[PDB]
Amino acid sequence: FALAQINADDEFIGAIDKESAEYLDEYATLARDISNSLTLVKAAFGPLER
Amino acid sequence: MDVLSKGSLKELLAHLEKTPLEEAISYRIGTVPYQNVLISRNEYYNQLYPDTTSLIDGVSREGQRNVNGLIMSIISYVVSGSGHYIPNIGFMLLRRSILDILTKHDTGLVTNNLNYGIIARNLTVSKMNCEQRKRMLICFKLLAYKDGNQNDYEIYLNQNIPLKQIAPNFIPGDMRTVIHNQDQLAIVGIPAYRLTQSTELSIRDDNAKSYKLGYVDWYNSNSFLRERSEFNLIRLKDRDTKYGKLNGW
Amino acid sequence: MDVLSKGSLKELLAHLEKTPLEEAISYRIGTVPYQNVLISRNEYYNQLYPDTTSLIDGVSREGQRNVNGLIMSIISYVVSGSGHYIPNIGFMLLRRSILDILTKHDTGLVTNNLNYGIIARNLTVSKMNCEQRKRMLICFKLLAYKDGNQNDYEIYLNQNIPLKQIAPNFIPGDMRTVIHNQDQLAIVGIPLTQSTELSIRDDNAKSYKLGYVDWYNSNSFLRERSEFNLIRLKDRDTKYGKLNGW
Amino acid sequence: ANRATSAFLDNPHPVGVNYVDEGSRQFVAVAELLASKLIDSSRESDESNSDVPFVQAYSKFADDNPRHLRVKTGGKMANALTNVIRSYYSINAPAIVPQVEIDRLASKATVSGDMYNSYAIFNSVPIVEVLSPARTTVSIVGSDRADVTMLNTGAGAANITFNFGQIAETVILKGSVPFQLARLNQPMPAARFTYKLRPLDGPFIVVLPVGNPLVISATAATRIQVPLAFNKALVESGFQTAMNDGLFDIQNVNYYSSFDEFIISQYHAQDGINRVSTCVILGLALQAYDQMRRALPVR
Amino acid sequence: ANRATSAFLDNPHPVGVNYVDEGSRQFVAVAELLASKLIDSSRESDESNSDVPFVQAYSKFADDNPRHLRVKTGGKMANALTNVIRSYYSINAPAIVPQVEIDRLASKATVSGDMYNSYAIFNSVPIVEVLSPARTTVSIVGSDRADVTMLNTGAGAANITFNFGQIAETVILKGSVPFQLARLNQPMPAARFTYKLRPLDGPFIVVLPVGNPLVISATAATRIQVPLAFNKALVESGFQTAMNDGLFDIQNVNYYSSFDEFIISQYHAQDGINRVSTCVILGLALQAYDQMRRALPV
Amino acid sequence: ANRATSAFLDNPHPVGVNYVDEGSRQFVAVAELLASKLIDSSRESDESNSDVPFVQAYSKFADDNPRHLRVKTGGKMANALTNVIRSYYSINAPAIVPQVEIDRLASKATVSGDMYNSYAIFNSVPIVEVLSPARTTVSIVGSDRADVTMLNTGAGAANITFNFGQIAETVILKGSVPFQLARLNQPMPAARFTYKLRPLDGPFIVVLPVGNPLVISATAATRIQVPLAFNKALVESGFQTAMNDGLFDIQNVNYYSSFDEFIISQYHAQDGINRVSTCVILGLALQAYDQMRRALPV
């Protein structure tokens, strides 16, 4: 009954959404960090026993 | 698809009591079984892949108009998901449940003369898997106790050792045995492995995969009943209760 | 690769004056020039692709020891980028530049008996594009005016009407013609995908096209390292020993 | 009396009786629509230098995302369509496509499965029989245009009867030389070059004077109800692709040079009405098969 | 022994070897795309009662505004397309379009220029040779549907050998009367009206009885890789226009009644694979030539 | 006239039809991957001076930690792999392993059970038949290199027919002395030591002169699609290990010297394409078995 109008004209430069593009790109940096961290722990700490 | 999703003796037997016999039969003419055919499997080969049609595929096939054909269609529906083409059976028989046909004398069908050797041979048992064999042995056990042929059922199992090893343990007249049984009878379900949208060479495997991918779509659709979310919306008659038992058991 | 990027008559003539005959010739045996062969082009066909070898492919082939062989090697270098295998040419000829072989009498080579029709057939002028034919006619005209056989050049052009349409409009003696020429003779140039072509000539030509962008930047330092302390071979001073077999 | 007949009208093999219900015809209709979008997306991808339009269209068609090192064959929809096409062609072809698969693919798009919205004109000329007297020779050649060569060796003029069946709507006869043709028990008009005949009129008698041979070129047009999406050019290409791909190699079947001859031959048989309905569905399926195969090719 | 050969398979002339590289292929694909837009723009201009859609399309195609007094020819793109068509047909064509002109014309639109992402079916029937014994007459007529008329005048039945080449995919033979055909060193089946054969199977022997002539109608289908924009209806019409316009009027060349016969004849020559790729490019060029000339008659 | 055939090509027994679906194929791929880690854990143990790497590898393979009072067997996956191999060999073998157990074991590692992403070369030479006339002795010995001994005691030269099937891709024939061989209805060439031929071409005629015996050695190469993890050396060792352990001991089946003979014999059956897919999956299972049993003998 009280639907709010949503506009994103200022967010779009032509057909490109800058904020969404930069935010998605940060997952590539996180992916590199995850792989580097897992490999370092496996090298420093070998097979683990409890 | 619904019948193939049952994973326990309780659920499978409960489903057979609810469903009528018309689900077991099909009104599509299909083709004939035991025929050598060349099918097209282009994802793997350019030529035509040979195979043999059987009664265990999930496609409707023409069936004989006798009691032998009716029982083969019921077991085919349980172990494959589709039945055969036996028309003009009669509305009196088609209204009754699959369980009632299998284990009640009131229906009027006479199944005493049925031999388990040819039925297993015709419903090709060398091509079944472990889950399919268990369901067939359930149907044989239900029929045997209907006509008082328990001794014949035991001798048949003793002749075939592998069938005896996987034979479900339950007495058709007792509900405590169904509750205690812990066999896994599910042919379709949510897969732990990676299920892809690819074809399989055999007719049986391709049809089985179609049911498996179909169950995943149905599992995530709106027709599925999520008990953890809407258990208070089901009616009281069909709600899960431990006191619940099959009629006459 | 450098000879194919020249897009003007001025630049092509300047390159030939600087380049010695050594880079026009090659030291690799190769195979017989004309031969029906089956080659593998798996990007398109499972079967082997038929083709005919020639002297226009950028691959070395065997050439005889005569003026006809030397001329054919020079023209192939201009129109294809790779020369031919002429055995034991000699120091005196290798140190001379390509243009002096074509346009000067001090090289020691007689070219008065060259037959232009036979050379075009041997070079397979039919399977040449517009740019390659123009370069061949430039070399023919230079030789024609060097030996005074300007009439024979006109007779050859009259017999081949399509070549007469695209013939160069420069006189070797005059310089005003070279300055004002407007021909486009470039074969390789900066623009193509890393793909394979069916023909031997088309595949080899595309290899030069794809490698030109990389060659534009990498050749500068690698070259300068080679001749950092090396005497230039072109017109090298020597005792003028001998010219054997010519 | 000697008898001659068209080669393509001889022994029409039975057609399939499966996947002819409402759901199956809906599935074939959906397959044609999605195959058409696959062709268009491949063009849009090529003029745009981006694989996005093609990937999205293939994802709808195959319910899977394309991946390198895996050959794009169309997925489960292509498998079902190919096997269904075989079943339509002959009654000896197996039925190996489950009903749950047909229903799942039919729901991928919302299109009507009705196969009788429109019509189409088919050009095969049916010559059921040509009867000639003892001293005459008759030869029939062709299916798109039939050339009937008649030679009279006897002294007297001969009477040759032509039967064109009852299915074709019009037949036009043109002769190398003017000739006489009239219906049974009707006077023969002046010699003319052309005749327009309705095959339901009855057997037609043509006088063959002694001398040089007379050749008659026959052209016929018949109207068959087809879906509004039916395109004759695409169907013929799909018919040839299916024959070359080897999926019409079934036991005890007849082979035809075009879908035109196939549908007309089935029409000129007992229970020909029911065979034509199945053949129309197979024609639309062949249209889907053609478009899908061109979009995703093999060498 | 007598030999019978299809007329359209005799002595295929060598095709041009120019304008078949990636840049030249892109130019042909660009020309087809812009020629198609030229046709659609003319229809839009007529429907909308305005000349704005057509002026934009003609300007992109010809790099010049339309003028009422001047004639509409298509500009340099029309001349380049006309010249490459001549070069594609014969090796003796001048091939006088500069490379710089082609590269600048291929940069107008973005196309891959790939001529191997689809296929088309060509219906010409190849009959390389029909071997007949003495006292037998064999005649072959037609290229899209071949009729082989056979007459036996000897004492006994004759064996007639058919060779359909090694390229065509399937051949369907329908006779006037039922007849017998079998492969070499194979028993003959019962008389039948129809036969489906693979030309790779080998030469086929047909038993010809003494009496009335036997006519065999042949239909073949062959698959050839073509671009996705290939349209057989447009290619065939463009082929006729180019012949009428004199683009194929070169010395020492053969002539064909359709593009289907042209491509199949070049396929069956010695090393025919060399020529199929060039023939397909000519077909796409003829597609663009058709659409351009119909929009801008000259 | 006598006929001779290869011994290993006679009467292939039917293969199993279970454990072919995607889940079962992924179980075999997981078993191969995890069994490989078991072997490599030995080298890690030597370098690390401790048994911890082996304990980790066995715990993942068997779901239970290794014990010193128990003989290491492999647990559920070892039992599942053994029973699954039995089902593959014959259709008479029971399918005992449940589906649920297969899915649970298939979820241990991430793999794709694609068995059509590579190929392998199989060297078993198929000689379907060798037809010789009277007064001629022909003996076929060998399976990987077949030696055919030919003796002509007759008065004149004899013609002997070879049939190598329609499956093998190439066959190379090397004779003790130069001999003549040609296809059917072809002229014979000069005597040569070596012939390379395609079995699809047709039956081959070899001329046998009267005198000393002529021996021909046949080597063939066949390409069969296999998963990328396929290793012929490991598969061959697994075949011998399984036969020794009695996994193939079941009534009404045939016995082969190597996996090379088993797969080629099945491929030359009435419908050999149906059995090739199952045989390849048996190969991967055997490769897993060889690694698992060598690390954990029992």
Side-chain angles (χ1 to χ4, degrees):
Chain A
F1 175 48
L3 246 192
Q5 204 181 26
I6 310 205
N7 268 347
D9 211 5
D10 66 323
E11 295 288 89
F12 268 97
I13 273 163
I16 289 161
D17 191 29
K18 291 174 65 175
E19 316 201 359
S20 285
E22 316 179 326
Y23 193 96
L24 189 56
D25 202 63
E26 297 217 44
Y27 278 103
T29 312
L30 183 56
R32 176 174 323 248
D33 293 333
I34 285 164
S35 170
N36 293 349
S37 304
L38 266 156
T39 324
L40 257 194
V41 172
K42 198 190 155 93
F45 308 83
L48 295 158
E49 60 241 26
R50 194 188 26 109
Chain B
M1 176 189 309
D2 61 356
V3 54
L4 299 179
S5 33
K6 301 317 180 213
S8 32
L9 214 46
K10 198 189 178 161
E11 296 164 17
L12 179 62
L13 284 194
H15 172 82
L16 288 185
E17 158 145 3
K18 157 179 21 164
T19 184
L21 187 62
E22 255 210 324
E23 297 315 288
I25 85 190
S26 295
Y27 292 129
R28 293 178 179 83
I29 186 167
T31 38
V32 299
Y34 320 123
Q35 192 207 357
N36 283 289
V37 291
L38 284 167
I39 66 198
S40 155
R41 289 276 130 81
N42 219 233
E43 150 174 351
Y44 301 108
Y45 302 113
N46 276 319
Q47 33 162 329
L48 299 143
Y49 187 84
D51 211 53
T52 325
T53 57
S54 64
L55 292 182
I56 283 321
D57 326 304
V59 200
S60 159
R61 300 277 201 268
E62 252 170 312
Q64 307 187 303
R65 333 280 271 251
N66 41 10
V67 171
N68 217 331
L70 191 43
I71 292 312
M72 293 204 258
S73 167
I74 286 158
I75 306 179
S76 293
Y77 167 71
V78 175
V79 315
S80 178
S82 148
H84 306 330
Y85 179 59
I86 309 126
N88 289 61
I89 294 185
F91 80 98
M92 294 300 293
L93 231 47
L94 291 182
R95 290 293 195 160
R96 319 228 41 199
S97 93
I98 299 191
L99 206 55
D100 302 13
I101 300 281
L102 285 162
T103 179
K104 260 195 185 26
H105 271 296
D106 184 1
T107 69
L109 206 75
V110 182
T111 47
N112 305 284
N113 58 289
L114 278 206
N115 192 348
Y116 305 144
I118 318 86
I119 293 185
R121 245 180 65 255
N122 298 350
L123 283 199
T124 52
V125 81
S126 55
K127 308 183 137 23
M128 302 201 177
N129 49 68
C130 183
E131 280 81 13
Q132 290 184 318
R133 284 153 164 161
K134 283 197 249 267
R135 298 185 167 226
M136 188 196 53
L137 293 189
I138 288 150
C139 295
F140 284 176
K141 191 157 206 173
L142 281 157
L143 272 159
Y145 280 72
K146 174 213 164 143
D147 322 87
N149 276 105
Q150 303 108 332
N151 178 71
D152 289 345
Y153 179 73
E154 292 323 298
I155 297 297
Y156 165 73
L157 279 190
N158 290 359
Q159 292 316 291
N160 315 116
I161 299 319
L163 289 188
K164 170 104 141 142
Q165 270 165 281
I166 62 96
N169 171 229
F170 82 108
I171 273 74
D174 186 322
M175 210 36 186
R176 284 119 77 224
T177 85
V178 189
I179 286 312
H180 291 159
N181 197 259
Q182 30 173 92
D183 283 3
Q184 309 270 31
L185 312 152
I187 320 192
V188 298
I190 286 313
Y193 57 96
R194 163 199 324 180
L195 199 52
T196 37
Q197 300 248 354
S198 72
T199 326
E200 302 247 346
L201 301 134
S202 173
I203 303 171
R204 291 188 342 281
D205 282 33
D206 200 22
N207 300 339
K209 183 126 163 223
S210 313
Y211 279 106
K212 268 181 262 265
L213 296 167
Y215 184 69
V216 173
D217 279 1
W218 184 73
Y219 187 96
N220 305 316
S221 96
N222 48 47
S223 317
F224 187 69
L225 215 171
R226 310 200 187 148
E227 285 272 339
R228 282 172 182 192
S229 295
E230 46 208 51
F231 63 96
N232 49 18
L233 294 187
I234 318 170
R235 333 191 208 228
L236 210 55
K237 334 173 309 174
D238 289 345
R239 293 195 183 174
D240 289 345
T241 39
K242 183 180 68 65
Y243 295 93
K245 64 179 180 180
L246 264 39
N247 269 323
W249 287 44
Chain C
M1 189 105 60
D2 43 15
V3 86
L4 299 181
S5 39
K6 310 311 207 203
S8 312
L9 186 71
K10 292 169 325 176
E11 289 210 67
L12 190 53
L13 287 192
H15 189 262
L16 294 190
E17 233 183 318
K18 183 158 29 43
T19 297
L21 185 68
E22 196 176 32
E23 335 172 44
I25 82 151
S26 161
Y27 295 93
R28 309 182 178 270
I29 311 267
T31 82
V32 179
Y34 325 94
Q35 205 204 332
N36 273 298
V37 294
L38 285 162
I39 68 188
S40 158
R41 297 279 189 255
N42 202 41
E43 179 171 319
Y44 303 112
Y45 297 116
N46 300 289
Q47 75 207 283
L48 292 194
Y49 181 85
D51 216 339
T52 317
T53 51
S54 91
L55 294 181
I56 293 332
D57 311 345
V59 152
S60 284
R61 313 253 182 235
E62 181 69 71
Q64 316 131 43
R65 207 153 164 300
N66 36 31
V67 202
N68 253 302
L70 249 202
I71 289 326
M72 266 172 240
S73 174
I74 281 165
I75 300 183
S76 318
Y77 170 76
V78 174
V79 316
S80 87
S82 172
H84 300 329
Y85 173 75
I86 322 285
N88 296 338
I89 282 135
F91 178 60
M92 314 264 312
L93 282 181
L94 287 180
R95 85 177 177 45
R96 297 310 292 285
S97 34
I98 298 179
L99 213 51
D100 313 352
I101 302 274
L102 287 172
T103 77
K104 283 209 212 341
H105 295 89
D106 37 42
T107 41
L109 248 64
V110 317
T111 62
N112 218 281
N113 306 279
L114 265 39
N115 197 305
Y116 298 132
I118 294 181
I119 293 192
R121 259 175 271 140
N122 283 329
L123 286 169
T124 71
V125 68
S126 64
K127 292 189 292 185
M128 277 192 187
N129 40 273
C130 184
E131 288 71 60
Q132 283 169 336
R133 296 168 146 132
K134 293 179 179 179
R135 287 169 170 236
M136 197 203 37
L137 291 177
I138 283 145
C139 291
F140 282 176
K141 196 152 200 190
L142 285 177
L143 284 166
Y145 278 70
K146 174 214 153 153
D147 290 75
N149 307 325
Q150 323 160 11
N151 278 350
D152 310 7
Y153 177 66
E154 296 310 304
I155 310 192
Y156 167 68
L157 272 196
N158 286 319
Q159 275 156 345
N160 300 65
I161 300 279
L163 293 174
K164 199 203 204 353
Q165 211 53 58
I166 56 98
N169 59 266
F170 95 105
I171 280 84
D174 199 344
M175 177 114 72
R176 317 192 296 262
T177 73
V178 184
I179 289 191
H180 294 325
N181 209 303
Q182 286 278 131
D183 277 24
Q184 318 264 336
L185 320 165
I187 291 156
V188 86
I190 283 176
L192 276 208
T193 84
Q194 287 261 349
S195 154
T196 296
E197 307 275 8
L198 288 153
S199 151
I200 301 170
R201 319 185 299 310
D202 283 312
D203 207 337
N204 298 0
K206 187 150 149 132
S207 303
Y208 281 100
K209 266 188 250 302
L210 289 175
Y212 179 60
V213 202
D214 194 359
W215 177 89
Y216 203 67
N217 305 132
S218 316
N219 80 94
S220 206
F221 188 57
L222 295 174
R223 268 158 168 201
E224 275 139 47
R225 256 197 55 141
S226 44
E227 334 93 338
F228 170 49
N229 270 325
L230 193 96
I231 186 167
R232 297 294 181 192
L233 189 95
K234 183 180 68 65
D235 287 40
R236 207 185 255 158
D237 47 90
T238 189
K239 63 177 172 61
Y240 303 137
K242 295 180 182 297
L243 211 49
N244 289 284
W246 312 99
Chain D
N2 309 355
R3 214 185 73 121
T5 201
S6 275
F8 78 103
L9 279 174
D10 181 65
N11 219 45
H13 66 289
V15 286
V17 296
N18 282 288
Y19 326 94
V20 277
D21 56 329
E22 185 58 77
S24 309
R25 291 177 326 221
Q26 191 151 19
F27 151 72
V28 175
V30 164
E32 204 274 307
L33 181 68
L34 292 192
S36 93
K37 270 158 192 11
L38 206 37
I39 271 286
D40 265 339
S41 63
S42 270
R43 292 258 309 230
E44 190 194 347
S45 158
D46 167 90
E47 293 164 6
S48 178
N49 210 46
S50 66
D51 278 356
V52 157
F54 171 77
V55 164
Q56 297 192 96
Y58 184 88
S59 289
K60 206 142 298 296
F61 188 85
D63 264 345
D64 181 65
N65 206 340
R67 289 193 56 223
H68 311 285
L69 281 181
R70 266 182 149 154
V71 52
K72 292 182 292 297
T73 191
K76 301 218 106 185
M77 203 160 212
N79 194 249
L81 192 69
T82 49
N83 297 315
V84 157
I85 283 175
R86 286 193 99 232
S87 178
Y88 283 142
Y89 194 69
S90 161
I91 211 152
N92 302 315
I96 61 148
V97 178
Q99 189 60 27
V100 317
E101 182 82 22
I102 286 316
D103 300 328
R104 208 201 83 231
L105 304 149
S107 83
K108 291 233 260 215
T110 77
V111 298
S112 77
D114 156 17
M115 301 271 169
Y116 314 113
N117 282 334
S118 86
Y119 72 86
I121 297 276
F122 287 89
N123 276 30
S124 283
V125 48
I127 289 171
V128 188
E129 79 201 349
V130 168
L131 291 141
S132 33
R135 280 286 282 259
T136 47
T137 297
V138 166
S139 154
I140 291 159
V141 162
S143 323
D144 78 90
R145 150 167 78 68
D147 305 309
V148 196
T149 319
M150 301 156 286
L151 177 63
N152 200 0
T153 316
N159 272 25
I160 299 158
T161 180
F162 272 82
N163 184 30
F164 292 114
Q166 296 130 41
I167 303 301
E169 265 156 73
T170 196
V171 172
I172 292 151
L173 293 204
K174 273 160 178 131
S176 37
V177 307
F179 72 119
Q180 288 202 295
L181 179 140
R183 319 176 29 181
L184 265 161
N185 302 333
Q186 225 72 346
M188 297 250 194
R192 299 142 46 172
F193 259 118
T194 206
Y195 291 88
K196 153 142 145 73
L197 323 167
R198 176 169 71 120
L200 258 179
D201 282 328
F204 305 96
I205 306 276
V206 41
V207 202
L208 188 70
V210 54
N212 290 326
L214 162 74
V215 191
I216 292 180
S217 307
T219 278
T222 189
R223 180 182 293 176
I224 304 196
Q225 280 166 297
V226 295
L228 201 31
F230 197 93
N231 190 227
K232 266 194 74 177
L234 291 183
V235 168
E236 300 315 305
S237 178
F239 194 87
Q240 303 294 6
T241 298
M243 183 176 282
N244 299 15
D245 286 354
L247 65 94
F248 285 163
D249 289 345
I250 331 184
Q251 293 177 335
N252 289 337
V253 301
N254 235 21
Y255 302 87
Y256 305 80
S257 324
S258 35
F259 183 80
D260 289 345
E261 291 160 69
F262 172 70
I263 199 157
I264 290 320
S265 195
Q266 301 288 336
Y267 216 105
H268 282 78
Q270 207 257 309
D271 58 271
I273 296 333
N274 289 284
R275 292 171 164 222
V276 63
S277 322
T278 311
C279 292
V280 162
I281 305 165
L282 162 74
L284 203 59
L286 284 172
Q287 180 169 333
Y289 185 62
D290 181 65
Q291 280 166 113
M292 176 178 73
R293 267 278 152 280
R294 303 214 267 86
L296 330 171
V298 315
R299 71 171 65 199
Chain E
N2 316 339
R3 256 193 92 251
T5 300
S6 308
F8 81 101
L9 281 182
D10 180 36
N11 199 46
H13 63 280
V15 288
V17 288
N18 270 312
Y19 307 120
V20 286
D21 49 56
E22 215 206 84
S24 306
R25 290 188 259 123
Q26 261 150 28
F27 154 69
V28 172
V30 161
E32 203 275 306
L33 191 64
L34 294 196
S36 91
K37 282 168 181 17
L38 210 46
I39 274 278
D40 290 64
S41 297
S42 317
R43 308 274 259 106
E44 194 183 358
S45 269
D46 289 345
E47 197 200 315
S48 203
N49 213 22
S50 174
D51 273 3
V52 177
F54 174 70
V55 155
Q56 300 180 231
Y58 184 78
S59 297
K60 179 62 173 171
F61 195 82
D63 322 322
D64 220 320
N65 253 314
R67 266 193 84 174
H68 282 124
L69 295 320
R70 314 274 209 258
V71 79
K72 312 194 206 317
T73 36
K76 329 274 302 289
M77 193 132 184
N79 277 130
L81 199 44
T82 324
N83 289 327
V84 299
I85 281 160
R86 315 174 110 121
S87 190
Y88 283 146
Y89 193 64
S90 187
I91 192 134
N92 321 124
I96 48 74
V97 169
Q99 203 218 36
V100 290
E101 183 77 40
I102 272 148
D103 313 310
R104 88 143 174 106
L105 285 176
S107 87
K108 292 175 144 187
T110 167
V111 285
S112 295
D114 192 26
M115 333 269 302
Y116 273 85
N117 44 4
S118 178
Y119 67 84
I121 275 145
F122 296 98
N123 281 104
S124 285
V125 63
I127 296 168
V128 187
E129 88 199 351
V130 170
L131 292 168
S132 71
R135 266 156 326 159
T136 54
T137 309
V138 175
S139 149
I140 320 184
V141 174
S143 297
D144 60 293
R145 201 238 307 144
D147 321 281
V148 201
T149 319
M150 314 146 87
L151 199 46
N152 198 357
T153 41
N159 276 20
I160 293 182
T161 314
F162 282 79
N163 183 35
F164 289 113
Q166 299 275 87
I167 303 301
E169 290 230 23
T170 82
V171 181
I172 287 199
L173 301 183
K174 290 179 164 162
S176 50
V177 290
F179 72 106
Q180 272 160 333
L181 188 147
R183 322 173 39 222
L184 261 190
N185 289 337
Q186 285 255 315
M188 297 274 180
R192 195 187 340 163
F193 268 97
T194 169
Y195 280 97
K196 190 194 107 129
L197 328 165
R198 305 193 326 91
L200 271 306
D201 280 335
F204 310 101
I205 324 288
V206 180
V207 166
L208 184 63
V210 201
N212 279 352
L214 169 70
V215 198
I216 292 175
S217 319
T219 288
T222 316
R223 263 195 285 199
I224 276 158
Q225 316 234 66
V226 294
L228 256 168
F230 205 88
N231 202 5
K232 275 183 71 68
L234 292 167
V235 164
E236 295 287 343
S237 185
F239 190 85
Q240 306 298 349
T241 297
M243 183 176 282
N244 290 24
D245 276 5
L247 302 196
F248 303 148
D249 283 32
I250 317 200
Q251 58 299 352
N252 289 337
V253 306
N254 248 311
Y255 294 100
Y256 312 83
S257 35
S258 88
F259 176 83
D260 201 315
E261 309 180 9
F262 170 68
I263 187 161
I264 295 310
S265 185
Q266 300 290 0
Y267 210 113
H268 279 77
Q270 225 261 324
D271 319 328
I273 271 285
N274 300 5
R275 329 190 168 182
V276 177
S277 74
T278 306
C279 288
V280 169
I281 305 179
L282 175 56
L284 200 65
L286 287 170
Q287 187 172 316
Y289 184 81
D290 175 338
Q291 300 169 306
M292 162 207 322
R293 288 274 83 115
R294 272 198 289 115
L296 304 165
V298 152
Chain F
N2 289 337
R3 88 182 271 286
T5 165
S6 274
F8 72 102
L9 262 169
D10 181 65
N11 212 15
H13 64 272
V15 285
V17 312
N18 301 114
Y19 311 128
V20 157
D21 38 350
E22 197 154 76
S24 306
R25 262 158 21 207
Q26 288 183 24
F27 162 70
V28 177
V30 152
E32 200 274 293
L33 193 68
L34 294 200
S36 97
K37 311 274 209 68
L38 231 53
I39 283 288
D40 309 16
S41 81
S42 178
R43 193 54 101 201
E44 291 151 26
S45 294
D46 303 305
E47 297 165 273
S48 295
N49 306 9
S50 95
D51 263 326
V52 190
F54 179 79
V55 159
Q56 186 173 271
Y58 182 111
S59 283
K60 215 185 167 323
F61 191 82
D63 281 315
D64 304 325
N65 262 59
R67 288 323 193 60
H68 282 291
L69 62 80
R70 208 170 305 124
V71 162
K72 292 182 292 297
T73 56
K76 309 285 222 341
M77 183 176 282
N79 233 27
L81 192 70
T82 299
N83 286 318
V84 146
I85 275 170
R86 281 197 231 247
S87 180
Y88 282 147
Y89 203 60
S90 189
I91 204 152
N92 317 319
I96 271 286
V97 185
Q99 294 300 320
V100 63
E101 185 64 54
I102 294 204
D103 320 299
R104 179 188 75 87
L105 295 170
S107 46
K108 285 198 165 269
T110 166
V111 291
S112 91
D114 178 329
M115 313 270 155
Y116 297 92
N117 53 21
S118 188
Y119 63 85
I121 296 270
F122 292 93
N123 290 319
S124 272
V125 63
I127 302 184
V128 179
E129 87 202 12
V130 167
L131 290 149
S132 61
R135 256 177 325 290
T136 287
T137 299
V138 167
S139 159
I140 302 180
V141 196
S143 178
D144 65 9
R145 165 193 101 200
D147 320 88
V148 188
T149 316
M150 295 153 83
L151 212 171
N152 191 23
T153 59
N159 277 22
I160 317 201
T161 307
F162 273 86
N163 185 33
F164 292 103
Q166 306 290 304
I167 286 307
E169 281 188 325
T170 186
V171 173
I172 281 196
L173 298 178
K174 245 161 275 202
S176 38
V177 283
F179 63 104
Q180 282 174 288
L181 168 145
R183 331 179 33 207
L184 211 34
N185 286 357
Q186 294 300 320
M188 302 253 159
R192 291 158 29 198
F193 264 115
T194 304
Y195 296 70
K196 151 160 163 75
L197 56 75
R198 328 198 305 105
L200 191 62
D201 267 354
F204 300 100
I205 304 331
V206 51
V207 162
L208 190 53
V210 46
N212 303 32
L214 168 76
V215 199
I216 298 184
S217 303
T219 87
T222 317
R223 256 200 251 151
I224 304 190
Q225 284 190 265
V226 294
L228 211 48
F230 210 78
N231 189 237
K232 286 238 313 187
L234 288 167
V235 171
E236 282 290 332
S237 190
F239 198 81
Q240 312 284 350
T241 285
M243 230 198 318
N244 284 15
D245 304 342
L247 299 202
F248 299 159
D249 267 14
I250 196 193
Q251 59 311 342
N252 259 319
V253 305
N254 230 5
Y255 292 127
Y256 300 99
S257 313
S258 93
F259 186 73
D260 218 3
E261 312 176 358
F262 175 67
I263 189 156
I264 290 301
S265 165
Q266 298 281 327
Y267 201 24
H268 283 85
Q270 185 64 60
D271 290 339
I273 271 285
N274 315 359
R275 313 155 159 213
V276 149
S277 64
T278 302
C279 287
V280 173
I281 306 168
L282 178 57
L284 205 68
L286 281 174
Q287 147 170 3
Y289 195 71
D290 167 48
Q291 309 222 51
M292 176 200 76
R293 284 274 92 109
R294 257 187 309 124
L296 327 181
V298 64

